[PDB]
Amino acid sequence: QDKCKKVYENYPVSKCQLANQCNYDCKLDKHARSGECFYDEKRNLQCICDYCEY
Ligand code: NA
């Protein structure tokens, strides 16, 4: 799979900082298996949904 992960674009950064938010919104809003917040190389937080793994 080349497309396991995918940013949730314009996802609130404030929500990214809080437990469960990105994970459950990824599941709720995108039907994804999971999500997590990570920085990127420009050092800003993003919510990355994962469609392969829980
Ligand atoms: Na969490």
Side-chain angles (χ1 to χ4, degrees), residues 2-54:
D2 276 32
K3 317 91 73 14
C4 280
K5 293 198 186 295
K6 165 59 181 199
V7 183
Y8 195 138
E9 33 299 309
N10 312 332
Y11 181 81
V13 175
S14 58
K15 272 167 146 306
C16 237
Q17 290 172 75
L18 299 167
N20 292 327
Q21 295 284 314
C22 177
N23 191 31
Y24 298 167
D25 281 335
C26 277
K27 295 188 208 271
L28 253 179
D29 305 342
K30 305 203 125 51
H31 319 275
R33 300 181 162 193
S34 66
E36 281 177 284
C37 294
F38 298 97
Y39 283 166
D40 67 14
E41 187 256 19
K42 302 300 210 183
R43 305 299 145 86
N44 49 37
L45 287 183
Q46 301 181 301
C47 174
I48 311 277
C49 306
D50 185 323
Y51 293 85
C52 289
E53 300 188 13
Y54 311 85

